[PDB]
């Protein structure tokens, strides 16, 4: 019956802003703090700072003094924390909680979180490479082949093939972070090797972030 | 100011405790929380004062604390236990702790490598595609290698992922100049897992 919903992700370039919301139901909005913590990618949880509904008082955590500032509806029930000036390792899962009727800073009640990404790199749409079917890819029966979805800004690429009509044997495998800021995936298909000469397989690679849709026909070579 | 291991593995029925550490000064140490939490989703508050739990936790979640050491014990290991694990004392958090439950038997990954496409050549790139699935536990070790010279520069590999079968997967990338491809015999890459090692290779031919 109580809920904390979140607004959803953002991809920010270092020194923009960020405004996150938190929409409280369930329960009487000024009886419980509304408190804020982020989660560092491969990082336990960073308590932040809290808003008070009732009077709107806030607390922060050092850090986050002078970039951080929190405020609330209290005629609409949420919760709102701005983020001013980000940096790189401002990078994380940020979440909204409210404790236990203990009021013990135990955190009964989450929000579903926010991914907030800062970096420097720009939206960029990718680059689709076959990954043809040869001798040193086939299994007997069976072919791997697929494609290489290589230098995209920011997540995420769907993948599909010959519009959705060939499911079984898709697999597309999570993306790769380079060092350059950019991500990369492949996705590859197990087919019957006596295929290969007569049924076309096109890959669909779709990023919506940069408007971007390829398709790739993919053949042996 | 909170200090828990990195991980702690078991098998199912097993019970295995996580410790949570304060400073020696740390006088509100007693009201320790401990969460649950699937990585990118929501954490589930599990215990909350040292040992209460609330409604609808399983009995097999139990808290304790001796002094500045706080433990949370995991009765009868159970796949659905496998998470990360945070405990917290008001505003300071433990660094988590994964928790791995083998519960599968060990399964060889299938290896399959491609070599960069002729359509990557031709825009001055080069980009070695090795695809690691179907392993478990999803502790591979992945080396790449040039002709039988070991290659740490453009390596990316990623962490292994649940597949839907219960079974892991992970891609490693190379990065490499076309005239690196094409200058040497071979390249490879290599796959440990469990004592055994399966190597694909790749030639520019």
């Known amino acids: 019956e109580v809920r904390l919903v979140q607004s959803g992700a953002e991809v920010k370039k270092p020194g923009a802003s960020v405004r996150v919301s938190c929409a409280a139901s369930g329960y009487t909005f000024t009886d419980f703090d509304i408190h804020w913590l982020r989660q560092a990618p491969g990082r336990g949880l960073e308590w932040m700072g809290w808003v008070r509904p009732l009077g709107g008082g806030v607390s922060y955590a050092r850090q986050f003094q002078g970039r951080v500032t929190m405020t609330r509806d209290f005629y609409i029930d949420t919760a709102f924390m701005d983020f001013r000036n980000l940096k790189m390792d401002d990078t994380a899962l940020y979440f909204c909680?409210?404790?236990?009727?203990?009021?013990?800073?135990?955190?009964?009640?989450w929000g579903q979180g926010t991914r907030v990404l800062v970096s420097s790199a720009s939206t960029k749409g990718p680059s689709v490479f076959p990954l043809a079917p040869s001798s040193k890819s086939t299994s007997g029966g069976t072919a791997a082949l697929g494609c290489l979805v290589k230098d995209y800004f920011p997540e995420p690429v769907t993948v599909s093939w010959n519009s959705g009509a060939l499911t079984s044997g898709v697999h597309t495998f999570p993306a790769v972070l380079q060092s350059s800021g950019l991500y990369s995936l492949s996705s590859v298909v197990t087919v019957p090797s006596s295929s290969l000469g007569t049924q076309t397989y096109i890959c669909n690679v779709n990023h919506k972030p940069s408007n971007t849709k390829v398709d790739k026909k993919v053949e042996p070579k | 100011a909170l200090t828990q291991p990195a991980s702690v593995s078991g098998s199912p029925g097993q019970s295995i405790t996580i410790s949570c550490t304060a400073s020696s000064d740390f006088r509100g140490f007693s009201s320790v929380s401990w969460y649950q939490q699937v990585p990118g989703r929501a954490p589930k508050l599990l215990i909350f004062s040292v040992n209460r739990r609330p409604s609808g936790i399983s009995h097999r979640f139990s808290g304790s604390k001796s002094g500045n050491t706080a433990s949370l014990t995991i009765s009868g290991l159970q796949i659905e236990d496998e998470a990360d694990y945070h405990c917290?004392?008001?505003?300071?958090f433990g660094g988590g702790t994964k928790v791995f439950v083998l519960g599968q038997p060990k399964a060889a990954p299938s290896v399959t490598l491609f070599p960069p496409s002729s359509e990557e050549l031709q825009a001055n790139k080069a980009t070695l595609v090795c695809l690691i699935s179907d392993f478990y536990p999803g502790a591979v070790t992945v080396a790449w290698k040039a002709d039988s010279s070991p290659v740490k520069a453009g390596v990316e590999t990623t962490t292994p992922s649940k597949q839907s079968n219960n079974k892991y997967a992970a891609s490693s990338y190379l990065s490499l100049t076309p005239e690196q491809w094409k200058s040497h015999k071979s390249y490879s890459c290599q796959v440990t897992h469990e004592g055994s090692t399966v190597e694909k290779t790749v030639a520019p031919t």
């Open positions: 909680a409210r404790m236990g009727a203990a009021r013990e800073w135990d955190f009964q009640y």
């Open positions: 917290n004392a008001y505003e300071f």
